[PDB]
Amino acid sequence: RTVNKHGDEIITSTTSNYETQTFSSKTEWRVRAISAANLHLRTNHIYV
């Protein structure tokens, strides 16, 4: 959802890969699930 040169609030479909870098840090379902993997191996040192 962009604006044109005159600011007309249009919707465009672009293909130039220049603002496409995904962030995906510390708050994603995929990243969170990958962190949850091997969580069973983290239950050894039970600090009571």
Add this chain to the structure above:
RNA sequence: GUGCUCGCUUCGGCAGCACAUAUACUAAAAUUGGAACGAUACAGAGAAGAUUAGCAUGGCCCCUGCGCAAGGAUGACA
């Protein structure tokens, strides 16, 4: 149409007479076609040589070896 004829003829009318003499792309309407360098989309270094590494050839000067041609000076008793 206006006005007039000593006309027919009546004021209800008629016949003739003078003037009027040739506008308009004419158009209100009919329809189906072909259409940007305007936007968004892409690209965007939108002005450079379009290169530098060796060796061999070619020119000049020596040195050495071999060949060809023509030569110079010298050496050897029993």
